[PDB]
Amino acid sequence: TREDIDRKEAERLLDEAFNPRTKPVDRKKIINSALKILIGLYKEKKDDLTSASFISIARAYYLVSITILPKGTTIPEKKKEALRKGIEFIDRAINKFNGSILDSQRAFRIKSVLSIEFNRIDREKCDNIKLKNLLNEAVDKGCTDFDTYEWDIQIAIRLCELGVDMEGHFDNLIKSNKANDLQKAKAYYFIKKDDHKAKEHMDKCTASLKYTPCSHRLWDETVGFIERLKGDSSTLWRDFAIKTYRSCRVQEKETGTLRLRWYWSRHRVLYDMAFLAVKEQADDEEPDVNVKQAKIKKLAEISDSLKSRFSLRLSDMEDDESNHEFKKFLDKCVTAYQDGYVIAKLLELTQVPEGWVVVHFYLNKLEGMGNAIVFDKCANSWQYKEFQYKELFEVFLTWQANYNLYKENAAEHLVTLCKKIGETMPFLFCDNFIPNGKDVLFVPHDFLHRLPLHGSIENKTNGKLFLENHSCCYLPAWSFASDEYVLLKNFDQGHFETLQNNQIWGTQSVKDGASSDDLENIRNNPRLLTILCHGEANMSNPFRSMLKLANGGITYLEILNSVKGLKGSQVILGACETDLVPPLSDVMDEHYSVATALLLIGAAGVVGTMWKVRSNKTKSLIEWKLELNEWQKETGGAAYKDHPPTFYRSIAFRSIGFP
Amino acid sequence: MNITVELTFFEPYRLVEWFDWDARKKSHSAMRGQAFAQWTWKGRTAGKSFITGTLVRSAVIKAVEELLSLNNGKWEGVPCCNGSFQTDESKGKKPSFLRKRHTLQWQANNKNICDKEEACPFCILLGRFDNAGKVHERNKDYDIHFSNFDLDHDLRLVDIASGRILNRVDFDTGKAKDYFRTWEADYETYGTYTGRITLRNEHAKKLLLASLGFVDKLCGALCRIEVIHNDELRKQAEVIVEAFKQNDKLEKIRILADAIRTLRLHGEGVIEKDELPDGKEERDKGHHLWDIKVQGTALRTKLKELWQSNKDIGWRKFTEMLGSNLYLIYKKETGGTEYYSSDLFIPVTPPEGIETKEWIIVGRLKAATPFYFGVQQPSDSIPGEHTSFNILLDKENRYRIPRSALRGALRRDLRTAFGSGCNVSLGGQILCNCKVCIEMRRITLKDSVSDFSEPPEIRYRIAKNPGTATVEDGSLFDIEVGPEGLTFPFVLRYRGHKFPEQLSSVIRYWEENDGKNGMAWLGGLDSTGKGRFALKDIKIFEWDLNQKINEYIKERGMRGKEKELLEMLPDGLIPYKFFEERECLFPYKENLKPQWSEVQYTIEVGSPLLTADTISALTEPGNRDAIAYKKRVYNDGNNAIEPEPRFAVKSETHRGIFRTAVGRRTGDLGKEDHEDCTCDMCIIFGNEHESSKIRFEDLELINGNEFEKLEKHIDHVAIDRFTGGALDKAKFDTYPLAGSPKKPLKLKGRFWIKKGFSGDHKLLITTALSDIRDGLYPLGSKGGVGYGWVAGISIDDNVPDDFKEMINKINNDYVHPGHQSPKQDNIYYPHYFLDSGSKVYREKDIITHEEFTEELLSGKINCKLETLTPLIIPDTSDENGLKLQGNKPGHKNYKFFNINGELMIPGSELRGMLRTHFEALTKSCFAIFGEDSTKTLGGKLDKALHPCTGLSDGLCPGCHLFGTTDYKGRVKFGFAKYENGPEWLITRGNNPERSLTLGVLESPRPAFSIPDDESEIPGRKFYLHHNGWRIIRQKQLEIRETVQPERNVTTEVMDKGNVFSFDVRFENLREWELGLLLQSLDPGKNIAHKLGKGKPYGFGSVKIKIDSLHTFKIKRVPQSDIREYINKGYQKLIEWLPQWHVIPHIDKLYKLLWVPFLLEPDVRYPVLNEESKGYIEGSDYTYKKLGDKDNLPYKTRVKGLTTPWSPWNPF
RNA sequence: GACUUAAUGUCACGGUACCCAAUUUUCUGCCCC
RNA sequence: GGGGCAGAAAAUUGGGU
Ligand SMILES: [Zn+2]
Ligand SMILES: [Zn+2]
Ligand SMILES: [Zn+2]
Ligand SMILES: [Zn+2]
């Protein structure tokens, strides 16, 4: 009777763990104790272990699979091991005759839903044959009690997703008091093909999604259903894609005051396919100019929403006021991940200073060809164009690899990259898309951030530089746009010995050998803050990318909290090149450099430097004390044909900010 | 023109199953090992090894592109194009392997675009325009063909390869994300591969030969491409185990397994010619382990028989397999994250005129501390144990520093020097371009082994249970650690245009200069200071790879002949004279130098230090039950190992002492379980989810040459509470180091501090160090006896100033009346029994040894120890101490206990007397009893007074306070130094004029105490304080000529009024427990304890007085606070100035130790009928008349117990 | 010759078997028919 | 008319990646 009693105790503790009341931190310890108890049971009872102990083991292994979070972007190996162990331990249970109808039904249900979860995690381990076997087992057992166990409801909807008729359980699933709206919508659309009831449940489902964190089960499975609809060439996928976009935007609008987001490996495709939906709506033979313009504006809005936030894996996630919000957000997300299974002032996209044309960039991986949503206030007209970025990505990777070995000697690769930008984006030099003599603001996407868009070269024999005609300033996203002179220096001896010594243009509250305290101690907001130090890159957490100042330097996070006296000041971070702050590009680059932290604090604009340049050029830029795009043309930055290395230095300087 | 090309591997290359192109994708191991050597079977064993010609071709074309780039695409004067490494999937099929690697490119300089008429050497070595394409071997239409490379000699897989599990370690933490197995082969025996290269086009032979000479590594190893008694010993072990089971000694068959396993360190001559301990001369049993009758013969002789019958496998292999065998038999009877990891062409164009060079860093990686390069157990390393942890060795058993571990440590140090690196990702389609990766892709380094194939010393480890301060259930494991001082050759090749300052910083960090001392943490177990290698003998060379590449090809880059380079002259290898010094590198002093901060200090131990290494106690001669731990240091200067081994406190013991001190200071120790926690102890010392921020090192003994005898032989015993003699099996002798207050032991240890400690954490570590200095945590075993007590700490002057700054910061009025003895002046019995009763109190809620509770007290007590009668504490280390055996052989002459020539009292005796007194005082159970003795003696002790078993049933107040098995006591006594006084009791006629030949000391007979089953059991036995030494002094000549010389024992005696000073470091003691211990120490005037031999003769009467009581939560309490402690002790006693005689049991107790001479009562044992000194005529006092049932009734127990001073001759 | 390669593309030198645990707890070198 | 014990009981691996 030892097996039965300890199995009953294990069932008690598993039921207590399944209650959503307990925090996930203690849930791990209690379920580990349950695992220890059940394995201790299994040690002496390997000879045809009873059905109850095996069922408890399967439930416990499912729960150990759920409690372990995906540390990286990919599915964690521990979850796969837990799934494999659960199915392996339940194979012996299902291979033997339990003798109880209820126990056999429970075993079949848990095995089939475990196979479904393994298929969701990785189709290689369990293919559609496994799903068909799960259907056979469920039909044989008859575990279709929708009003008793939501476990049966989940297996029913998964089975119906396999393209097999489920009209036998249709009446039971019609009521489904324990189900959620998305399951009802899936059942209505798949079996009965009734779009009205499907959309009626869909609206409630997305309304509920509006108030749930991104780590919930509902988000991933609803985006999966939407992409299933898109692959089915249906017509209602666009509306729910846009509605899920809206729910995601509203949900994270308030949460994450530090410009943070939760990664779930399906957010990017959700935004991509909502973008595709609104794009198809825009080009759906619209007779009215107003509706097409509004659709393109919505295109720009969704492009900006993805850029306006962060993307941090919880491995990197795992004064003190900022840390409180960090801990609260992490706790809420990690709680909502497991709750799925257990029972200052905003800026409008249309208000822009007169004579400024903005170029919003969006790179959609699903479609495979990027977009450039432009907007000029001369005619107040929104228009967008499409372009290929894969070959441009090859050329950019070529330049990045050649630069990290031969920084100054890779000027030819920079010229090639600029020519590739001009060729792959011919609308930049087009009069209709971008009028000449108009100041341009860029909002580049993931890997377009590193591109010197201001240095684009037109596809001509004597292709004119894009910098000569337009004045360009960049921006990580549209959500970032909103006296004396101060200098800070932490460089090495032998460089920049002139500004520190001969300082007749200002630098009253200056600090040679500056520390993080010196940057934080700037009380009054100056007219120009100059920071002289080469910062280091954080290849994992962009929140901890630092400027190498004295006393350990100041990171991205410490700028957001300690530094307050910098509002409305044209900071010039012309000491560290822009590309030693963040990591390097691989397919996408969603990391934010230190200049973005300065912009978020309230700096009027950072005159950064894309690539490493000799000290003389940036020293001359600092000595240029009149209020970029005009200096580069006059200093010789348009001589790429004759002087490649001269083009390499001048182009590097870009102003990250919106005047 | 067929070209025969021969491979040669100079370090262990890697192996995988061949599988197939269409079948590789199903297997992760073979998909990861595409670049390894391939194994194909011929049963799943005894196959053939080979290297694919495609892999060799890829290496050759990579070398071709590197040679052309180094020459701006122009080899030997003929221009070479860029080739083409892009395949259009529309116009054909993709290659079997895709590059996803940066391709070195140059200018064109070609007369015409390459076609199949005048192709450049690069194109015809690539096979661009040959008649053979991506299709298979069909016809030999290849312009250049690379045939398969088969091994150059069945060939069983286990004979060639050896499975090893590799790793991928974090950087923020010291943990590993995942791991993966590998089949690293045997480069020494099976390390030569032969294949054929066929080249139809004769225009590009020179470039092909240069590329062959330029291929620097293949399959994970350096290459030089050159043109043209089980199943019977196990049965005998089973027989041995069965015979052990016949003797009911299966609990120690495991210990015999460890002794056999560690016999590998000893030579075969140990078992050939008897060097094992032979036991005592008259033991009649011999050794408890080696003189065991197994199958009718002693274990030593049959082990010699086995060694003679198993000479084939050799002493090391035979003893290893034997130990594993008995371990398996003992286990049989009792019951006993593998992560195996789009289409882009990235042309890299080196600038014209750049200068690229190759730098060789040849040196030696001397181990400053014993190292541990972990490896998986045997029977799990098979491709296709007894020791818990194994160290990595090759087929020749020599110690190995694997290329993977060295490369990983170098990468970690390089990332530290840069300060901004990546967590290396697996399966990425784009080369990582971070700073550390760029230099790591240019650094190649050689796997190297030490020329020292000797068995590794086993370093044992346990885990203490904080609740009881004893060993934990299933906490014992052993680790094989390499010797300290071993020198491994160090090879490091960097290829590039300039030597990075970060690699120079790593070398200087690793180098062992006059003050650098070496900082290359290699391998695992870094938290216990295992693997800090001090790289030395550094020599930096360089190749002019641009204008001197012909001789680089000719010498093959000196690959595999780095020993010749370290010994000393090849062309184009001028030494690198521009190696920046330590104080010239910004990254070094910025990131690497402040990474680890050394805290060196010298512990001064003023007591016998005993680390209790028991496995080596069995094998080493002398028959010591517990000897001190000693290291095994390899003398690199003179080769071999030092014959004299260094005594030390294990770095694990050091780390555990500091960790326990910190945990008890804060309170983290004692938690239910350490989950993913960020507590103070978890952060400082690491946990299961991170790495330690502090790494400790061995407490090596530096003051060892100033001792006449470094190890002092101390005998111990356990005395039965009832009979008063030693227990049935309790005599044991330890072998601690010689430690005295006048001449202490100096142990210079150190630990390293990471640059992340906050002020609170550094304050915590300094508080732990101060607690170590204050003596709260004695080193080694028997700490509650007086073993390894720390007398102070002397921090070195090289410690950082901030760290050093924080570090530098009675009479009792009770008088017992007494009776009888002064009312007559009559002879009494030398011993009496204290029937205290069976009312025993047990405390279920035991006091844990976790953080010091504020309610209770802890500290130290300084007590003076005055003697009222001569004290006998023999030093039984020397059986001939008085040099009197020559005149009278067989006489046991002893010397007074002394360490380094100063008279001391071992703390064991003081603790024994105090524990017995306290147990009698509090009605504690009989902690030590001769159970199952002739029903049985232990079967008639009622029920409560039995010795305490495990904590299930609770612990008696004496057992709670002084401790029992699996519960460390809360009071530690110390060795009592002399501190002045009248030293010796002169006899004027003794052999040394300062001794006293004692009478016949016979074992007690409980039959007299219990003459029949009617009497249940007498109480505890105590001896009165009679002045009976006077009769022995007077009858010195009458006892040296009448008693047997072989039975008489003589020893030096201390004179009257000798004082002794010792400490009592009570900890976590209750408010009343401290008072009761104070009363036990100093019962008051006219009451004194008995110590040492001759207690029935009146010898060794000791009076204890208290000097000063301390308490910390340093606060010397006053006399008022000393009172009201004993008061509540009395209050607790009654409910179970104080008036102790109120309680009858305490009244009789204090009557037993009442001194009736502080008039002169005479007390002695009776005699057998008309024996010597019969005195029959008047006060007969003889046995067989006093003991006769007719003459005297069975009321002897009535008069012998509960009557502390009843007369015998009149009644 | 096969037992094994595919050829205009093999960063696998592309990954430290790594992290946590105090050989310690208890015991007078003692003693009489 | 004689020396009696000279070691005893535990823990010898558990957790992770
Ligand atoms: Zn060519
Ligand atoms: Zn990297
Ligand atoms: Zn902790
Ligand atoms: Zn007890």
**Are the C-beta atoms of residues B488 and B452 closer than 8 Å to each other?**
no
Q: Which of A400, A405, A577 to mutate to test the interface with B (most CBs of B within 10 A)?
A: A405
Tokens describing residue B308:
């003679």
Tokens describing residue B945:
């007074």
Give me the residues paired with residue B390 across strands. B375
Task: Give the separation between CA B929 and CA B946, rounded to whole angstroms.
Answer: 8
Nucleotide nearest to B57 (CA to C1'): C7
Task: Give the separation between CA A575 and CA B759, rounded to whole angstroms.
Answer: 33
Residue with smallest Cα–C1' gap to D6: B731
Strand C, nucleotides < 7 Å from a protein CB: these are: 2-33
Task: Give the separation between CA B243 and CA B260, rounded to whole angstroms.
Answer: 17
**Eight-class DSSP state of B376:** P
Residue A492: list chain B partners with CB under 8 A. Answer: 586
- What's the distance, CA B943 to chain centroid? 42
Q: At B1202, is the secondary structure helix, strand, or coil?
A: coil
* B688 CB and strand C closer than 7 A: yes
Measured CA distances, B396 to B399, B630, B839 (Å): 9, 26, 67
Measured CA distances, A384 to A359, A372, A376, A616 (Å): 9, 5, 12, 40
Measured CA distances, B254 to B244, B250, B321, B457 (Å): 11, 8, 14, 18
Tokens describing residue A304:
């900006």
Ordered by start, the domain boundaries in chain B are 2-227, 229-336, 347-592, 600-809, 853-1002+1019-1136
Q: How far is the CA of B541 from the centre of ligand 1 (A)?
A: 35
Number of Cβ within a 10 Å radius of residue B795: 16
| Chain B nearest CA to A352, separation (Å) | 39
Q: Which fold has domain A483-627?
A: Rossmann fold (3.40.50)
Nearest CA in chain A to B672: A29
Measured CA distances, A575 to A48, A489, A551, A618 (Å): 71, 9, 18, 7
Task: Give the separation between CA B895 and CA A292, rounded to whole angstroms.
Answer: 110
* Tokens 């904590």 belong to residue: B951
Q: Which of B644, B606, B602 is nearest to B747 (CA)?
A: B602
Task: Give the separation between CA B165 and CA B380, rounded to whole angstroms.
Answer: 10
Report strand pairing: B164-169 vs B596-605: unpaired
Task: Give the separation between CA B104 and CA B1129, rounded to whole angstroms.
Answer: 88
Chain-chain contact of A583 with B434 (C-beta, under 8 angstroms): yes
**Are the C-beta atoms of residues B399 and B482 closer than 8 Å to each other?**
yes
Tokens describing residue A321:
């006021």
Task: Give the separation between CA A457 and CA A465, rounded to whole angstroms.
Answer: 5
**Are the C-beta atoms of residues B611 and B653 closer than 8 Å to each other?**
yes
Name where chain A breaks: residue before each gap, C-N > 2.5 Å: 318, 343, 482, 627
**Are the C-beta atoms of residues B816 and B1150 closer than 8 Å to each other?**
yes
Task: Give the separation between CA A152 and CA A172, rounded to whole angstroms.
Answer: 11
Task: Give the separation between CA B238 and CA B823, rounded to whole angstroms.
Answer: 71
Q: At B893, is the secondary structure helix, strand, or coil?
A: strand
| Chain B nearest CA to A129, separation (Å) | 18
**Are the C-beta atoms of residues A388 and A371 closer than 8 Å to each other?**
no
Chain-chain contact of A539 with B339 (C-beta, under 8 angstroms): no
Task: Give the separation between CA B51 and CA B13, rounded to whole angstroms.
Answer: 11
Q: Which of B915, B921, B872, B903 is nearest to B1062 (CA)?
A: B903
Residue B423: list chain A partners with CB under 8 A. Answer: 539-540
Q: Does domain A1-143 have CATH number 1.25.40?
A: yes
Q: How far is the CA of B676 from the centre of ligand 3 (A)?
A: 8
Give residue A238's identity as a one-letter amino acid code: R
Q: At A105, is the secondary structure helix, strand, or coil?
A: helix
* Tokens 């001064």 belong to residue: B604
The whole-number Å distance from B6's CA to C7's C1' is 20
Query: Between A29, A77, A584, which is nearest B675 by CB?
Result: A29
Query: Between A77, A397, A536, which is nearest B344 by CB?
Result: A397
Task: List, as one string, the DSSP characters of B808-863.
Answer: -------B----SHHHH--EE-SEEEE---S----BSSPPPSSS--SSSB---EEE
Q: Which of B397, B401, B402 is nearest to B454 (CA)?
A: B397
Tokens describing residue A206:
């997305």
Report the half-sphere exposure of B558 (CA within 13 A, side-chain side).
23
* B655 CB and strand C closer than 7 A: yes
Strand D, nucleotides < 7 Å from a protein CB: these are: 1-17
Neighbour-count burial of B1189, counting CB atoms closer than 10 A to its CB (0-12 exposed, 13-18 middle, 19+ buried): exposed
Q: Pseudo-torsion of CA B61, B63, B68, B71, nearest 10°?
A: -170
Nucleotide nearest to B787 (CA to C1'): C24
Alpha helices in B715-786 (DSSP H): 759-774
The whole-number Å distance from B846's CA to C11's C1' is 62
* B906 CB and strand C closer than 7 A: yes
3-state class percentages of chain A: helix first, strand second, coil last, to nearest 5: 50, 10, 40
Task: List, as one string, the DSSP characters of B371-412.
Answer: ---EEPPTTTSS----SSBEE-B-TT--BEE-HHHHHHHHHH
**Are the C-beta atoms of residues B75 and B404 closer than 8 Å to each other?**
no
Task: Give the separation between CA B963 and CA B966, rounded to whole angstroms.
Answer: 8
Chain-chain contact of A537 with B675 (C-beta, under 8 angstroms): no
- Resolution of the determined structure in angstroms stands at 3.1
**Are the C-beta atoms of residues B626 and B612 closer than 8 Å to each other?**
yes
Distance in angstroms between the alpha carbons of the first and the last residue of chain B: 123
Residue B345: list chain A partners with CB under 8 A. Answer: 394
* Tokens 């012998």 belong to residue: B1200
**Are the C-beta atoms of residues B220 and B404 closer than 8 Å to each other?**
no
Task: Give the separation between CA A70 and CA A334, rounded to whole angstroms.
Answer: 11
Measured CA distances, B311 to A386, B17, B306 (Å): 82, 37, 8
List Cβ neighbours of A379 (8 Å cut-off, separation of 6 or more).
none
| Chain A nearest CA to B280, separation (Å) | 46
**Are the C-beta atoms of residues B557 and B216 closer than 8 Å to each other?**
yes
Task: Give the separation between CA A617 and CA A646, rounded to whole angstroms.
Answer: 10
* B496 CB and strand C closer than 7 A: no
**Are the C-beta atoms of residues A403 and A429 closer than 8 Å to each other?**
no
Chain-chain contact of B673 with A583 (C-beta, under 8 angstroms): no
Chain-chain contact of B349 with A413 (C-beta, under 8 angstroms): yes
Task: List, as one string, the DSSP characters of A333-400.
Answer: HHHHHHHTT-------SS---TTEEEEEEE--TTT-EEEEEEEETTTTEEEEEEEE-HHHHHHHHHHH
Give residue B158's identity as a one-letter amino acid code: V
Q: How was this structure determined?
A: cryo-EM
For CA atoms A463, A467, A472, A473, the dihedral sign is positive
Instruction: Name the residues in B517-556 having a C-beta closer than 7 Å to nucleic acid strand C.
Output: 521-528
Q: At B727, is the secondary structure helix, strand, or coil?
A: coil
Q: At B480, is the secondary structure helix, strand, or coil?
A: strand
Distance in angstroms between the alpha carbons of the first and the last residue of chain A: 78
Residue with smallest Cα–C1' gap to D4: B1003
Q: Which of A320, A306, A316, A235 is nearest to A540 (CA)?
A: A316
Phi, psi of A505 (to 5 degrees): -95, 0
Chain-chain contact of A394 with B434 (C-beta, under 8 angstroms): no
**Eight-class DSSP state of B976:** B
The whole-number Å distance from B11's CA to C10's C1' is 20
Tokens describing residue A188:
């209505």
